[PDB]
Subunit: 371 residues, 3 copies
């Protein structure tokens, strides 16, 4: 136990020194403009330099609705669905995050404490506001019109700007990293009336005649350069750099009215946050199809069994607003769910109404060691 | 000497408790009723671990049975769904005893923004007021029924990380008492021209408004699995021997252009002060006040400010203004504390004073159990 | 050789004394002066603050009534609007040393940057309880119609100390001999109103009725924030000597010579530790939302850019700092945790590579920095 306490102390000190001595850099890695009808999957090759903290991905797109008369309107996720999936592999080909664009975006929001890169509305007479359209998409695209969209995603390796847990040391000249981006295409972006809008950007009677004109992306890599050297070479937080900080998502089915649907935290990961999306057969409701949600331990005791509005209240304290309809969030950052500290734990949803093809899309944020 | 070590130990124990125990939020009671029959309830919380506070959810349906006239929300609106709250701990010592609106304003001051609100942004992703956590229709038309939702946090512990004021109830045995007095058909509706201070809706149809029903659910927040050491449970004795209370009072006797001073009592460490200028039923946006201040006898004013400048300081604390006639003062970093009664006072020099004018004061403070 | 231990010890002593001062003294905010005037008669004032204890800064309240006397045309707020009620502010301490010397718009943008949101603004929420813009702390009508009179209110915080907890830059004002001086150069009928097609940079309103707009009056009230009842010890008053011997200043400048697709570089001077940088691209009177820029960057002598970004990505970083965008053509850069200091690395420069350059284009730079009094 002394070897550990000292190991953690050494790690923190090394982290603190790296942060004080190195200088942060953010620089463009690659940009590409394309038509997803031609290609929608791209493998970006990050530069191998210093300690890598994450990637900021700018995505723009132009969409045209050529329907003769009908419009389409943004889905609840909208531009967050411009990227369908993101997967990162480090120089040792160890996979870190692999999740959907919508889940990654919701975590970006949770970590910011407000809708990611949004512009807050105030009474200021000075002309602050949505000036630069950092994340933007027209509410509707009428028949015959073309809309322009902009979206940003932060793909994290390091947990934060000050906590390097999960960061990647990329100083091995011949071992490349891989950032795979799978973009939306005409098939995923447009949903007909009555179809499931989960993965779509726009939905409406004009959907069949909507097409992307183009999508463009620019990946910026954030890293620390001029790493401090000491009496043993680079001073590095060994625990930070051998821990993976990942996001992943999965789908669970088998819900029945008034019965507890339990999703066990199946791995021995340290779960920092959990997102549960109740895709009630293509319908996304504002809590009205749920009796309660909870986190429960094998001891059968609930640590937070709450009605939907009260559950939402806790989230409002975290992001200053509510996540979209049917999206529920749970913060476990200070005391991560770890099944080896207490019995197995489960995330619980007791549904009031269950439509055909109902399912819970689970999104997790967690730490785990490489070994 | 000493103390340095007493506080050092208290803080160490607090840290161990926060690190080792596990937080739980649990429903302890729910009830639906008709205020025509009853509006005062005494909730019995569970005696388990260290209790931090209670989240009280209140929902109500209001029917405007008037034939042709509507009513509209007052400035406090749903914050008046609970008229008063009183908490007694296992040792029969009272902590908070205040109005629902004062409790709500403190919840907002502590959050740094309107309590449990949804902030509006340009995000195209559909975040927003999706769940209507705190909600009430702006107006209820003649013949219509409106649905309202309100939440209040009754604190024992000062915060999630500062357990000062928390209550140990894992042992006490004796019961705790959380008393709640709800709005009723006599307090919720104000006629045009009547004082709207304690009401939820005001308007020409008020006389014919009534509650269809009210429901409440109390959730208790506490720490379980308390850490044990040599001498036994590791506990922050100072935290648990200190009361963190909210209290209200009313003062009258205001006259144009004369300093109206409300004295702070001794012994209490006042963290915040709220003063509501109920100018005879009229609530104005500072236009009826010359200035407000906090003053020490023989040391003058530490912050004598015009109303807008006073409001500017508040905008730095809650990112907006409190409702008309509601003034806030933050003294958290250096609490008002006098060894002599009234060695410090809160001042309001009114420009205009209507009949039946008064200041409704609200205080947040720390004080020793002994 | 070494002996640098002195610095280490000096820093510790400075921090200890700062803490003692913060713990023992009591904060006071007090009105020092209020005046109502007609800008046609005068617009420059020199305020003499009180010499009491350690001065942290000044909160300046400014109100105005503007009438648009045009027979038919209206005027509308410029992007800066009421932030241009004060054109320039300059502070001198008792030793007659200059601290902040900048434009009202720059001071206001820094007030916003340090708050983490539009300065003293009222956010909008779904709360049914009537919070909101109740007190109109900073306010100005979006337009003033022909024949109408509009009322404005704006506030500026002129900092001496860096913050309420970091007294770096604060001023000890106890010498009865020499007075401090806070100079305010206000807007007047020649700066506040821009005709259609004229440069709106320094104006409050712009539009077809501008030539007939006039101030009815402007009023200001200066409140001084300071620490009184300073703690004493064996060696007398306990005081953070480094904090009180360091200047925390805001200054602005102007540079021209931009050409399409060529890097325009503005060098940071040596000795100053730059906490933030603001660059306003006054493209010949046109202020655009990034569309006239290829990219912006901060660069060191080594061709090494630490953040060469396209305008929207640059704007994204700013949204993380103030929760919204600064007005069109206004770009912000936060270097608070690692201040730009040309001694730490080679010379450093702020870069703008413009896509389009109109005649009379220029970059207006605003800086926040720390520097030794000596
Ligand atoms: Cl009943
Ligand atoms: Cl005059
Ligand atoms: Na192809
Ligand atoms: Na609502
Ligand atoms: Na009645
Ligand atoms: Na009372
Ligand atoms: Na306003
Ligand atoms: Na003029
Ligand atoms: Na200068």
């Amino acid at each position: 136990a002394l070897r550990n306490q000292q190991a953690m102390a050494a790690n923190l000190q090394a982290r603190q020194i790296v942060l004080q001595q190195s200088y942060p850099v953010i620089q463009q890695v690659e940009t590409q403009t394309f038509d997803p009808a031609n290609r929608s999957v791209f493998d970006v090759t990050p530069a191998n330099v210093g300690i890598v903290k994450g990637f900021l991905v700018k995505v723009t797109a132009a969409i045209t609705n050529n329907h003769a008369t009908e419009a389409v309107a943004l889905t609840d996720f909208g531009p967050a669905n411009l990227v369908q999936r993101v997967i990162y592999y480090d120089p040792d080909n160890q996979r870190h995050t692999e999740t959907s664009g919508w889940h990654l975006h919701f975590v970006n929001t949770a970590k910011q404490g407000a809708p990611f890169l949004s512009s807050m509305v105030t009474d200021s007479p000075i002309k602050y506001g949505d000036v630069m359209n950092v994340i933007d998409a027209p509410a509707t695209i009428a028949a015959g019109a073309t809309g322009e969209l902009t979206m940003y995603y932060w793909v994290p390796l390091a947990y934060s700007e000050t906590d390097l847990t999960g960061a990647v040391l990329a100083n091995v000249p011949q071992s490349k990293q891989r950032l795979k981006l799978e973009f939306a295409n005409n098939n995923t972006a447009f949903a007909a009336v009555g179809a499931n809008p989960l993965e779509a950007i726009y939905q409406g009677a004009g959907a069949a005649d909507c097409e992307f004109e183009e999508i463009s992306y620019t990946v910026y890599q954030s890293y620390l350069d001029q790493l401090p050297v000491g009496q043993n070479g680079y001073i590095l937080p060994l625990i930070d750099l051998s821990t993976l900080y990942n996001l992943e998502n999965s789908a669970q089915a088998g819900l029945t009215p008034n019965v507890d649907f339990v999703v066990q935290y199946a791995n021995l990961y340290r779960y920092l946050s959990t997102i549960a999306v109740f895709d009630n057969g293509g319908s996304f409701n504002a809590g009205t199809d749920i009796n309660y949600l909870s986190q429960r331990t094998a001891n059968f005791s609930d640590t937070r069994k709450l009605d939907p509005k009260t559950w939402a209240a806790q989230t409002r304290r975290r992001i200053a607003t509510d996540f979209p309809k049917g999206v529920y969030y749970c913060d476990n950052r200070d005391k991560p769910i770890y099944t080896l500290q207490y019995g197995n734990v489960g995330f619980v949803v007791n549904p009031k109404t269950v439509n055909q093809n109902a399912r819970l899309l689970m999104g997790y944020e967690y730490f785990t060691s490489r070994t």
